[PDB]
Short mmCIF file of C-alpha atoms in Angstrom, two decimals:
data_model
loop_
_atom_site.label_atom_id
_atom_site.label_comp_id
_atom_site.label_asym_id
_atom_site.label_seq_id
_atom_site.Cartn_x
_atom_site.Cartn_y
_atom_site.Cartn_z
CA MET Z 4 -127.82 12.76 127.49
CA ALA Z 5 -126.54 15.98 127.32
CA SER Z 6 -126.12 18.01 124.23
CA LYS Z 7 -122.89 18.34 122.15
CA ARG Z 8 -121.02 21.69 122.91
CA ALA Z 9 -118.88 23.69 119.84
CA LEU Z 10 -116.64 26.42 120.43
CA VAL Z 11 -116.13 29.05 117.08
CA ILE Z 12 -112.83 31.07 117.88
CA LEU Z 13 -113.70 34.70 116.04
CA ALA Z 14 -111.30 36.96 115.13
CA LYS Z 15 -111.09 40.05 112.70
CA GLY Z 16 -111.02 39.38 109.31
CA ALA Z 17 -112.68 35.66 109.51
CA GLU Z 18 -114.67 34.64 106.56
CA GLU Z 19 -117.77 35.64 107.91
CA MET Z 20 -119.74 32.71 105.28
CA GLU Z 21 -117.13 30.63 107.15
CA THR Z 22 -118.27 31.70 110.44
CA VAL Z 23 -122.36 31.89 110.35
CA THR Z 24 -123.14 28.63 108.32
CA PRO Z 25 -121.29 26.43 110.68
CA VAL Z 26 -122.69 28.48 113.46
CA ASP Z 27 -126.15 28.61 111.75
CA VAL Z 28 -126.29 24.45 111.32
CA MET Z 29 -125.05 23.15 114.19
CA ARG Z 30 -127.59 24.89 116.20
CA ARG Z 31 -130.16 23.29 113.58
CA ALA Z 32 -128.37 20.15 115.07
CA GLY Z 33 -129.15 21.13 118.64
CA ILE Z 34 -125.54 21.46 119.13
CA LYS Z 35 -125.06 24.36 121.74
CA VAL Z 36 -122.50 26.55 120.12
CA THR Z 37 -120.22 29.61 121.63
CA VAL Z 38 -119.23 31.98 119.31
CA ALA Z 39 -116.56 33.33 120.99
CA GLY Z 40 -114.30 36.75 119.88
CA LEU Z 41 -110.67 36.32 120.30
CA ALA Z 42 -110.33 39.74 121.10
CA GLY Z 43 -113.11 40.53 123.73
CA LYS Z 44 -116.41 40.79 124.06
CA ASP Z 45 -116.91 43.12 121.60
CA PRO Z 46 -118.20 42.94 117.90
CA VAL Z 47 -115.80 41.58 115.39
CA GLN Z 48 -115.44 43.27 111.87
CA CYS Z 49 -115.18 40.02 109.30
CA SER Z 50 -113.31 40.27 106.02
CA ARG Z 51 -116.21 41.21 104.17
CA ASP Z 52 -117.17 43.92 106.83
CA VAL Z 53 -120.17 41.91 108.02
CA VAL Z 54 -119.92 42.87 112.01
CA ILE Z 55 -121.06 39.85 114.36
CA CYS Z 56 -121.44 40.53 118.34
CA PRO Z 57 -119.71 37.38 120.05
CA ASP Z 58 -121.49 35.37 122.33
CA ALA Z 59 -118.78 35.56 124.76
CA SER Z 60 -114.98 36.34 124.90
CA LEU Z 61 -112.83 33.68 124.33
CA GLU Z 62 -111.32 34.57 127.86
CA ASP Z 63 -114.30 33.92 129.17
CA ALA Z 64 -115.55 30.94 127.23
CA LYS Z 65 -112.64 29.14 127.31
CA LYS Z 66 -113.12 28.88 131.57
CA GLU Z 67 -116.16 26.90 130.52
CA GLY Z 68 -115.08 24.23 128.54
CA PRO Z 69 -114.42 21.21 127.64
CA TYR Z 70 -116.02 21.43 124.00
CA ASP Z 71 -116.73 18.63 121.96
CA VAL Z 72 -115.42 20.66 118.97
CA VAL Z 73 -113.66 23.85 118.64
CA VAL Z 74 -114.04 25.40 114.95
CA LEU Z 75 -111.69 27.70 113.81
CA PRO Z 76 -112.91 29.42 110.42
CA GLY Z 77 -110.90 30.91 107.57
CA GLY Z 78 -110.46 34.54 105.81
CA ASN Z 79 -106.39 34.72 105.79
CA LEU Z 80 -106.10 37.49 108.36
CA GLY Z 81 -108.70 35.75 110.43
CA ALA Z 82 -106.25 32.76 110.19
CA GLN Z 83 -103.08 34.90 110.54
CA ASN Z 84 -104.71 35.99 114.12
CA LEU Z 85 -105.69 32.53 115.29
CA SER Z 86 -102.02 31.68 114.65
CA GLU Z 87 -100.73 34.55 116.71
CA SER Z 88 -102.42 33.68 119.99
CA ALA Z 89 -101.21 32.26 122.63
CA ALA Z 90 -104.61 31.17 124.28
CA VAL Z 91 -105.80 29.41 120.75
CA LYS Z 92 -102.51 27.51 121.06
CA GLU Z 93 -103.25 26.59 124.71
CA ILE Z 94 -107.46 25.31 123.79
CA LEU Z 95 -106.10 23.65 120.52
CA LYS Z 96 -103.76 21.37 122.60
CA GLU Z 97 -105.86 20.68 125.24
CA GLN Z 98 -108.48 19.53 122.81
CA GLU Z 99 -105.98 17.35 121.37
CA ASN Z 100 -105.23 15.70 124.59
CA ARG Z 101 -108.74 14.94 125.13
CA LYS Z 102 -109.41 13.35 122.00
CA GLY Z 103 -111.42 16.19 120.85
CA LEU Z 104 -112.36 16.63 117.79
CA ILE Z 105 -110.93 20.12 115.97
CA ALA Z 106 -112.65 21.24 112.49
CA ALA Z 107 -111.23 24.05 110.21
CA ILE Z 108 -112.08 25.34 107.00
CA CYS Z 109 -110.07 27.70 104.18
CA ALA Z 110 -107.00 29.33 105.31
CA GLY Z 111 -108.26 28.11 109.20
CA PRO Z 112 -105.82 25.25 109.32
CA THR Z 113 -102.92 27.12 108.85
CA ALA Z 114 -103.81 28.02 112.61
CA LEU Z 115 -103.32 23.81 113.16
CA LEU Z 116 -99.39 24.13 111.46
CA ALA Z 117 -98.63 27.14 113.81
CA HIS Z 118 -99.51 25.43 116.73
CA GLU Z 119 -98.00 22.24 115.85
CA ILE Z 120 -101.63 20.64 116.17
CA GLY Z 121 -102.42 17.59 114.34
CA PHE Z 122 -99.04 16.55 112.69
CA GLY Z 123 -98.78 14.07 110.32
CA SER Z 124 -102.98 13.56 108.97
CA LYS Z 125 -103.86 13.79 106.25
CA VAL Z 126 -105.93 17.68 105.66
CA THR Z 127 -107.45 19.92 102.86
CA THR Z 128 -107.25 24.06 102.66
CA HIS Z 129 -108.16 26.39 100.82
CA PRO Z 130 -106.06 26.14 96.87
CA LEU Z 131 -104.49 29.40 98.22
CA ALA Z 132 -103.58 28.32 101.68
CA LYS Z 133 -101.61 24.81 100.69
CA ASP Z 134 -98.07 26.39 100.20
CA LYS Z 135 -98.96 28.00 103.81
CA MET Z 136 -100.00 24.77 105.20
CA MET Z 137 -97.65 22.37 103.85
CA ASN Z 138 -94.80 23.95 104.55
CA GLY Z 139 -92.06 21.71 106.59
CA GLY Z 140 -93.94 18.72 105.23
CA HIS Z 141 -96.12 17.82 108.36
CA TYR Z 142 -99.09 17.03 106.79
CA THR Z 143 -100.45 14.89 103.69
CA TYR Z 144 -102.54 17.51 101.32
CA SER Z 145 -105.81 16.48 99.96
CA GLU Z 146 -108.34 17.86 97.39
CA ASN Z 147 -111.30 16.49 99.22
CA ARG Z 148 -114.08 19.08 99.52
CA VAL Z 149 -113.48 17.92 103.35
CA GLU Z 150 -111.27 16.04 104.55
CA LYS Z 151 -111.07 13.94 107.89
CA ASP Z 152 -108.18 11.76 109.55
CA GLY Z 153 -109.52 11.20 112.91
CA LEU Z 154 -109.62 14.12 115.24
CA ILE Z 155 -109.13 16.64 112.09
CA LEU Z 156 -111.60 17.88 109.82
CA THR Z 157 -110.81 20.03 107.55
CA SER Z 158 -112.50 21.68 104.17
CA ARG Z 159 -111.81 24.47 101.54
CA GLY Z 160 -113.52 27.34 101.22
CA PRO Z 161 -117.11 29.44 101.40
CA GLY Z 162 -118.44 26.38 98.84
CA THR Z 163 -117.91 23.69 101.25
CA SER Z 164 -119.19 25.39 104.57
CA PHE Z 165 -122.41 23.34 104.33
CA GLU Z 166 -120.32 20.07 103.75
CA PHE Z 167 -117.72 21.03 106.04
CA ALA Z 168 -120.63 21.74 109.10
CA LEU Z 169 -122.27 18.74 108.39
CA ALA Z 170 -119.45 16.99 108.65
CA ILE Z 171 -118.97 18.02 111.97
CA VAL Z 172 -122.31 17.44 112.49
CA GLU Z 173 -122.16 13.64 111.82
CA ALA Z 174 -118.90 13.51 113.83
CA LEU Z 175 -121.11 14.85 116.80
CA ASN Z 176 -124.43 13.66 116.40
CA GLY Z 177 -124.63 10.98 114.03
CA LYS Z 178 -124.90 10.32 110.23
CA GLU Z 179 -128.80 10.51 110.72
CA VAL Z 180 -129.31 13.71 112.46
CA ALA Z 181 -126.78 15.09 109.73
CA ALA Z 182 -129.20 13.67 106.98
CA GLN Z 183 -132.58 15.39 108.37
CA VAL Z 184 -130.32 18.76 109.31
CA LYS Z 185 -129.76 18.57 105.60
CA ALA Z 186 -132.40 18.30 104.01
CA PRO Z 187 -134.44 21.40 104.51
CA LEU Z 188 -131.34 23.25 103.14
CA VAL Z 189 -132.56 22.82 99.80
CA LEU Z 190 -128.52 21.65 99.06
CA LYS Z 191 -127.49 20.83 95.31
CA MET F 4 -118.75 54.43 85.91
CA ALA F 5 -119.94 54.31 89.38
CA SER F 6 -119.80 51.27 91.26
CA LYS F 7 -123.35 49.35 91.57
CA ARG F 8 -125.38 49.89 95.44
CA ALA F 9 -127.45 46.69 96.91
CA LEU F 10 -130.10 47.66 99.90
CA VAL F 11 -130.15 44.39 102.84
CA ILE F 12 -132.95 44.82 104.33
CA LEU F 13 -132.20 42.53 107.83
CA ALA F 14 -134.87 42.08 110.16
CA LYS F 15 -135.47 40.12 113.54
CA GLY F 16 -135.12 36.68 112.76
CA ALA F 17 -133.81 36.49 109.38
CA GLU F 18 -131.78 33.94 108.26
CA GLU F 19 -128.17 34.88 108.84
CA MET F 20 -126.64 32.29 106.45
CA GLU F 21 -129.16 34.09 103.70
CA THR F 22 -128.06 37.17 104.78
CA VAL F 23 -124.24 37.00 105.30
CA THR F 24 -123.89 34.83 102.03
CA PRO F 25 -125.04 37.47 99.91
CA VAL F 26 -123.87 40.50 101.01
CA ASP F 27 -120.41 38.82 101.18
CA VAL F 28 -120.26 38.14 97.39
CA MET F 29 -121.81 40.90 96.40
CA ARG F 30 -118.73 42.68 98.16
CA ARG F 31 -116.25 40.42 96.00
CA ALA F 32 -118.06 41.75 93.25
CA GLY F 33 -117.64 45.64 93.74
CA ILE F 34 -121.16 46.34 95.07
CA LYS F 35 -121.39 48.50 97.73
CA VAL F 36 -123.61 47.21 100.11
CA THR F 37 -125.88 48.87 103.33
CA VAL F 38 -127.15 46.32 105.31
CA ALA F 39 -129.90 48.21 106.95
CA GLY F 40 -131.79 47.06 109.76
CA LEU F 41 -135.29 47.52 109.69
CA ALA F 42 -135.79 48.31 113.54
CA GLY F 43 -133.17 51.08 113.60
CA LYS F 44 -129.07 50.85 114.05
CA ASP F 45 -128.94 48.05 116.70
CA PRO F 46 -128.06 44.79 116.20
CA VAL F 47 -130.22 42.20 114.76
CA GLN F 48 -130.98 38.90 116.74
CA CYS F 49 -131.16 36.74 113.33
CA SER F 50 -132.80 33.18 113.34
CA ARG F 51 -130.17 30.74 114.61
CA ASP F 52 -129.23 33.61 117.19
CA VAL F 53 -126.21 35.21 115.16
CA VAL F 54 -126.18 38.30 115.97
CA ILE F 55 -125.26 41.09 113.58
CA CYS F 56 -124.79 44.69 113.60
CA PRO F 57 -126.32 46.54 110.64
CA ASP F 58 -124.38 49.64 108.58
CA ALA F 59 -127.35 51.88 108.99
CA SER F 60 -130.97 51.42 110.18
CA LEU F 61 -133.29 51.21 107.20
CA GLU F 62 -134.89 54.91 107.92
CA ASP F 63 -131.82 56.27 107.14
CA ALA F 64 -130.45 54.43 104.59
CA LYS F 65 -133.94 54.44 102.46
CA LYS F 66 -132.94 57.84 102.22
CA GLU F 67 -129.53 57.53 100.51
CA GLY F 68 -130.85 55.51 97.68
CA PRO F 69 -131.68 54.39 94.75
CA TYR F 70 -130.17 50.88 95.04
CA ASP F 71 -129.32 49.26 92.11
CA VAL F 72 -131.01 45.87 93.83
CA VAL F 73 -132.94 45.60 96.68
CA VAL F 74 -132.69 42.14 99.06
CA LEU F 75 -134.99 40.00 101.20
CA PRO F 76 -133.06 37.33 103.12
CA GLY F 77 -135.23 34.99 104.54
CA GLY F 78 -136.47 33.26 107.40
CA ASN F 79 -139.68 32.86 108.81
CA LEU F 80 -140.42 35.26 111.32
CA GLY F 81 -137.60 37.67 109.37
CA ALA F 82 -139.63 37.25 106.36
CA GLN F 83 -143.06 38.30 108.50
CA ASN F 84 -141.26 41.02 110.29
CA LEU F 85 -140.38 42.60 106.13
CA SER F 86 -144.29 41.66 104.98
CA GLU F 87 -145.56 44.06 108.23
CA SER F 88 -143.35 47.16 107.31
CA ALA F 89 -144.94 50.32 105.72
CA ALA F 90 -141.10 50.89 105.32
CA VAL F 91 -140.43 47.82 103.56
CA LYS F 92 -143.98 48.29 101.30
CA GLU F 93 -142.64 51.91 99.97
CA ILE F 94 -139.19 50.85 99.05
CA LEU F 95 -140.32 47.77 97.24
CA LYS F 96 -142.93 49.94 95.28
CA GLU F 97 -140.72 52.42 94.62
CA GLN F 98 -137.84 49.85 93.17
CA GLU F 99 -140.60 48.47 91.12
CA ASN F 100 -141.63 51.90 89.85
CA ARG F 101 -138.06 52.57 88.53
CA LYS F 102 -137.30 49.61 86.95
CA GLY F 103 -135.19 48.40 89.82
CA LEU F 104 -134.07 44.20 90.68
CA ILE F 105 -135.80 42.98 93.54
CA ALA F 106 -133.96 39.82 94.98
CA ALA F 107 -135.78 37.44 97.48
CA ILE F 108 -134.73 34.11 98.77
CA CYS F 109 -136.55 31.18 101.11
CA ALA F 110 -139.74 32.70 102.83
CA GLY F 111 -138.25 36.78 101.47
CA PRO F 112 -140.36 36.60 98.57
CA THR F 113 -143.71 36.14 100.83
CA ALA F 114 -142.82 39.62 101.66
CA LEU F 115 -143.05 40.30 97.98
CA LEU F 116 -146.88 38.78 97.86
CA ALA F 117 -147.75 41.09 101.42
CA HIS F 118 -146.75 44.45 99.45
CA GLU F 119 -148.10 43.72 95.94
CA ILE F 120 -144.99 43.25 94.15
CA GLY F 121 -144.38 41.53 91.19
CA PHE F 122 -147.32 40.22 90.46
CA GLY F 123 -147.83 37.89 86.86
CA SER F 124 -144.29 36.67 87.72
CA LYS F 125 -142.77 33.17 88.09
CA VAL F 126 -141.15 32.64 91.41
CA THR F 127 -139.72 30.48 93.37
CA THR F 128 -139.61 30.33 97.31
CA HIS F 129 -138.72 27.65 99.94
CA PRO F 130 -140.70 24.20 99.83
CA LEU F 131 -142.52 25.26 102.86
CA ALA F 132 -143.36 28.76 101.65
CA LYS F 133 -144.88 27.69 98.62
CA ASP F 134 -148.20 27.45 99.80
CA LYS F 135 -148.00 31.31 101.37
CA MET F 136 -146.64 32.80 98.41
CA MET F 137 -149.06 31.14 95.94
CA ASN F 138 -152.31 32.17 97.90
CA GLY F 139 -154.70 33.80 95.43
CA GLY F 140 -152.80 32.74 92.49
CA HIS F 141 -150.93 36.20 91.52
CA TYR F 142 -147.56 34.33 90.95
CA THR F 143 -146.44 31.24 88.91
CA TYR F 144 -144.37 28.88 91.28
CA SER F 145 -141.31 27.55 89.82
CA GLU F 146 -138.90 24.76 91.05
CA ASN F 147 -135.81 25.99 89.80
CA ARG F 148 -132.43 26.85 92.62
CA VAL F 149 -132.24 31.05 90.98
CA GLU F 150 -135.96 31.92 89.22
CA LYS F 151 -135.31 35.31 87.53
CA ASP F 152 -138.12 36.86 85.54
CA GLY F 153 -137.40 40.53 84.87
CA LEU F 154 -136.92 42.46 87.36
CA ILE F 155 -138.08 40.10 90.14
CA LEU F 156 -135.09 37.60 91.51
CA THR F 157 -136.33 34.98 93.62
CA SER F 158 -134.26 31.29 94.90
CA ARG F 159 -135.07 28.23 97.58
CA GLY F 160 -132.84 28.29 100.80
CA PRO F 161 -129.69 28.26 102.28
CA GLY F 162 -128.22 26.02 100.23
CA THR F 163 -129.23 28.42 97.54
CA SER F 164 -127.33 31.51 98.59
CA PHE F 165 -124.18 30.95 96.39
CA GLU F 166 -126.40 30.83 93.31
CA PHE F 167 -128.88 33.39 94.25
CA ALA F 168 -126.27 35.96 95.13
CA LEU F 169 -123.95 35.16 91.98
CA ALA F 170 -127.35 35.63 90.03
CA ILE F 171 -127.40 39.13 91.59
CA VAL F 172 -123.86 39.76 90.86
CA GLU F 173 -124.74 38.75 86.76
CA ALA F 174 -127.60 41.01 86.53
CA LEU F 175 -125.78 43.97 87.91
CA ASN F 176 -122.59 43.17 87.10
CA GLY F 177 -122.49 40.84 83.58
CA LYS F 178 -121.38 37.23 83.39
CA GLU F 179 -117.69 37.44 83.67
CA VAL F 180 -117.60 39.42 86.80
CA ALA F 181 -120.00 36.52 87.85
CA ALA F 182 -117.50 34.03 86.65
CA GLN F 183 -114.14 35.39 88.61
CA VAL F 184 -116.29 35.89 92.02
CA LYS F 185 -117.15 32.64 92.09
CA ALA F 186 -113.81 30.56 90.82
CA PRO F 187 -112.26 31.43 94.35
CA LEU F 188 -115.63 30.21 96.27
CA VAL F 189 -114.77 26.26 95.82
CA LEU F 190 -118.62 25.60 94.66
CA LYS F 191 -119.40 22.23 93.76
#
């Protein structure tokens, strides 16, 4: 069986912890992860000024799908960039149409609202992003640290990144792989 | 009063989560953080293949000190590179001589052993790095998630990175700043 594949969409102003922790944990799980730069191949200046070099442009990575999961990091400005992108809209609608997992953390879920993805689901967000996500009442809000309603998997903040990433691993590779990846991490 | 300053030494094979989370949290605390590349100015390939562009070479950053804290990420190969570096030895011995904080996580503390820093302290490490750290009995081992004995601050693994970074913030900027930085993170 072929390894599962993840697309992580990296925009200027993304929360770097919410990019790096899921990428790292998914690679620990033996998932083939592509960090794709929204704007192109060039390095991306994250919210706290960490600069990450993407594996590929989104323009190129989006031709190499499909992916088992599409991951949207948070950060207020990163999520706003994801929300404004027609390319992101197309990728998310294709993923939803093929019944593939979509995972978003912190402010990231607000890009689901912008692109009309997953309406009628239970979702969580960062507390400060709740009102934006809930505009129109298209989702039902949850305060769970990770929330999964079918193929929409959401989480709250930097401090839920491990839980979020391990939930992706469990969904793709099963509970046993998630448990094995978790143990060396020294999680509380 | 001038802002505190942190030097984060980034080597090939570093654990990217243990680099990014402390950098981000320290910047949230208003610390001026320099991510310095051990090998030079070029991008650094971390343990799980995240590629980070340093702010400066170590060669340049080490002339712009002193720093309030010197931070050593983990990752087995990153820590081995830190342990082999004469430049790292000199920086750590200068920091120790000026009674400045030194903070190391996961395998990172083993570079303290290599450079003969902080002998006679209580330290923790990743469980798998204990035997290396304890060779010769020069430290006393702790299983605390974060351990601080004077100016030597150590921690265990990816899942202790927030605790580690917030301990640095508390040491530099006080408990109230650490508490204020912590709340928006959604930590368990």
